[PDB]
Nucleic acid binder design. Sequence first.
RNA 1: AAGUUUGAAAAGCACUUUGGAAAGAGAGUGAAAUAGAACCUGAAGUCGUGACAAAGACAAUGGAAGUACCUCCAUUUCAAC
RNA 2: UAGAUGUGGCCUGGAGGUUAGGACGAAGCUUAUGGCGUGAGCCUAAGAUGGACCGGCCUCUAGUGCAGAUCUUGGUUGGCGUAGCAAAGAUCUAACGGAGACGUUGGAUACUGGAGCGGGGAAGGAUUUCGUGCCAACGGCACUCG
RNA 3: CCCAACUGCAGACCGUACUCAUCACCGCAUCAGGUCCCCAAGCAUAGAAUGCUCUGGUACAUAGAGAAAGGUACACUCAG
RNA 4: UUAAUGAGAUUCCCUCUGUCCCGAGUUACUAUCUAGCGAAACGACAGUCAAGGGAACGGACUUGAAGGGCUAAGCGGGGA
RNA 5: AACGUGUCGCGAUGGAUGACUUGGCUUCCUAUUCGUUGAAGAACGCAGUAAAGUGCGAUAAGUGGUAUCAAUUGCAGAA
Lengths: 78, 61, 117, 154, 50
Amino acid sequence: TKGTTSMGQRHGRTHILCRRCGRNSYHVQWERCAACAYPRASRRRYNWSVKAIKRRRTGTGRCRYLKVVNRRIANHFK
Amino acid sequence: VSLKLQARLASSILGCGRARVWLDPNEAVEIQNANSRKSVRKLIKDGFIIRKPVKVHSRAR
Amino acid sequence: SRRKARRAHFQAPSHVRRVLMSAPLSKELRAKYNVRAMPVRKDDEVIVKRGTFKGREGKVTACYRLKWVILIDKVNREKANGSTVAVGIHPSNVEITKLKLTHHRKSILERKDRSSK
Amino acid sequence: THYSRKPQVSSKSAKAKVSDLRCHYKNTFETANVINGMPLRKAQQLYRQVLAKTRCIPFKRYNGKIGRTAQAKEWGQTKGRWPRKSVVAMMSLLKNAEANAIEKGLDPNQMVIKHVQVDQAARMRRRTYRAHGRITPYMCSPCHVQLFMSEKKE
Amino acid sequence: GRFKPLAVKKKYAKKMNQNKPVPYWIRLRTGNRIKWNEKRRHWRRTKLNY
RNA sequence: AAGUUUGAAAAGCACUUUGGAAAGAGAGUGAAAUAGAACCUGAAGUCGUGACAAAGACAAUGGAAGUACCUCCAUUUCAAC
RNA sequence: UAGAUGUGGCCUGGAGGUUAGGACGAAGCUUAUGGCGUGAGCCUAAGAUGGACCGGCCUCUAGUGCAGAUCUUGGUUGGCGUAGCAAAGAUCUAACGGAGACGUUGGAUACUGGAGCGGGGAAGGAUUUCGUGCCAACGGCACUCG
RNA sequence: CCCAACUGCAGACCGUACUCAUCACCGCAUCAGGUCCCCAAGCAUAGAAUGCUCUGGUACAUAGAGAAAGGUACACUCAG
RNA sequence: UUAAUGAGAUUCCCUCUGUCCCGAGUUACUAUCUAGCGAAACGACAGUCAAGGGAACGGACUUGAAGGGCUAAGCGGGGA
RNA sequence: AACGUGUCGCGAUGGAUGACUUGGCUUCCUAUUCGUUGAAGAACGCAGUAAAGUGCGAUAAGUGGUAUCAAUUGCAGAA
Ligand SMILES: [Mg+2]
Ligand SMILES: [Mg+2]
Ligand SMILES: [Mg+2]
Ligand SMILES: [Mg+2]
Ligand SMILES: [Mg+2]
Ligand SMILES: [Mg+2]
Ligand SMILES: [Mg+2]
Ligand SMILES: [Mg+2]
Ligand SMILES: [Mg+2]
Ligand SMILES: [Mg+2]
Ligand SMILES: [Mg+2]
Ligand SMILES: [Mg+2]
Ligand SMILES: [Mg+2]
Ligand SMILES: [Mg+2]
Ligand SMILES: [Mg+2]
Ligand SMILES: [Mg+2]
Ligand SMILES: [Mg+2]
Ligand SMILES: [Mg+2]
């Protein structure tokens, strides 16, 4: 039927790992990340999910060059 | 005390399979001291781990 | 505030945690140098002024400077198995009786003393 | 904290516990209360015959649709069982409190089981699986067992 | 089963190492908040799929 | 979801012995272990055993009014109103 | 009853005042602890409770009173040791190990029956492999095994 | 000149354990469900039928004691 | 209108039978008892009847009649 | 009798409450706004002993400079 039986036909993969977003939303067949729109230069970003914007903003990661450059520009250098 | 390892790989040295390797029961510390498929090949050469004959599936009927 | 002080205290770096762990000099070692109190250093002989081990003199073995305590060499404590351990008296409960020299301590000690004189 | 009742003489008494006794509170309840005034030797003699299934544990208060048996008439009932795991688990808690009677210098052949007390522990959890995808609990319900002893002067 | 990219292989190896217990020199540290690892995966319970 | 917020200090129960080891009983630490790491307090709910009126079921509860016995609960008298 | 209104009227959190307690034990908590208020409630005592905060009064303030929302969350409980653990292979023994129904070896009888409880792969899973331990909880029984 | 044959040196990257299922995957789970491919013995027999066997694999799917009623069966017979 | 085909709908006949007259015996597996394990749905309180009245078919009210208690296996009348 | 009650003392479970609060929220304020000179993001790494996290990048739990003084600390090690 359409429950435990049809759950057995779950062989393929719709999504694989996104080289840019690092998560598992890279739709294989039409090759685009379902969560950052890779290979689109702009990452997908929609105001109708501000909560998901917040999971993806700056500072949510390492923020290497900024934790440095924000120190240089706040000390009269650049 | 358990002879699972010495029985698993002696069946992989005799190349027969289980229920064909006969691990001598009257001595296990002899077999248990094997713990290696070269120390078992020596054991096979000695009395302790014979391979029992396969079977007689008659065909005279 | 209450909230920011109990954070700058417990979140204080190590070199800050040493001036927050200063102990008063004895009654006859202050006017020896004319200052009020010093941060405790390893190997500076002291005397406890408060606690179960009060009035017990000893040489500071270490400044265990994240427990917020100093370790005195004669203030020990027994575990269950005989092995003796060292209890940590907060420096403010201690009164320094000895110092350790330095061309950076009897120079800052008269930086504090040049305030008086 | 310890021990609902004090033995009313502490040197003429032994004490023993378990905390996570690993089996049913309800089987362990009557396994324990069945020996609650007996001498220590008459209590092991009970349990060691419950295991040979010649005497039973009269289930009171947690009988609840257990089968009737002939061996429960002495206990004034019709119901009773032979819980092996809860009996072998107090063969051990008693022989502990024996070792506490020798340790103080008390003949265990004089010990009376005063005040057994069984109660409930933290009730471990391991889900099971119902029809239609309903994940129901399958609580384990361990138990604590207390008991102390005493002597009877001639 | 036998085909995994090397990149997908580098990511399960980074998970086989993260699946070790907290060593018993961590819980005697002065003020740690760690008693268990609380990120241990079991291959049956939860899957990584990467 | 999750304050392990034990204690001032890990001083985190050495050691004895019952257990195959856990755990238990002892000791011992400390102001408290009746603060023993699933640790401040520790409630309700439910449960356990000990006691009892040891009562007494023939729904529970409750109302009023008594009585039985029992309550370191209050008060008063305790050569007096 | 719906409703309205009053109360020098009750209560919770906090503020401004005042009065005042507290390691000679505060909040809290317990109750056959009484008393006293018609009541909301307050006060006391006594805790083999608790360990460090807080009461009264006048104003102020509000996230201020709960039994009932197929309320929400957490926890417990009855039914209850009850339904059940009934499709798919029947374990039987020796002597051995072990702290001990368990395991191992031997023998025995079987089952799968070559569209397999076989040997290899893809998809998927990614250490599940192996060995040596281990046996707390997990393997819906148990385990010395996993 | 050009190629072969003979030598000489070198031959790099990734995968590779295990699994592939009544315990490893999906099904919430060690779930009677689902899931692609290869290898395929003997005899009866038209024979990948079905029955039984050699190889290989497996007898840790809870177990025990019994005659209720009632029940469920890839369980039966039943006078006229 | 039609030959063929039909897990289509329908009627009869033949055979055949436990569909039945009318049931009975046997068998596994269960239920039953035990060791181990252990849920849940549901839950105001509950819980013997008749009659009366009543939101007009009451477990509680009224008036009668039974009812000692606690129980195991059943069953399916009621608990609208 | 046992069971079932029922009140009391003591326990267990439970984790409310109170007390605490390096967190939140709100309000205000003082200055300056990343990237092709490769950002943000994520990936994998790095510790004598480190799984996570924090920090860092094969100079990897940091090197340099100054400025400070004697620790770090679970315990090694180390002027
Ligand atoms: Mg494609
Ligand atoms: Mg492009
Ligand atoms: Mg965009
Ligand atoms: Mg408020
Ligand atoms: Mg409100
Ligand atoms: Mg409420
Ligand atoms: Mg309710
Ligand atoms: Mg399956
Ligand atoms: Mg899923
Ligand atoms: Mg065979
Ligand atoms: Mg017939
Ligand atoms: Mg309901
Ligand atoms: Mg009846
Ligand atoms: Mg019945
Ligand atoms: Mg709270
Ligand atoms: Mg900008
Ligand atoms: Mg780069
Ligand atoms: Mg990291």
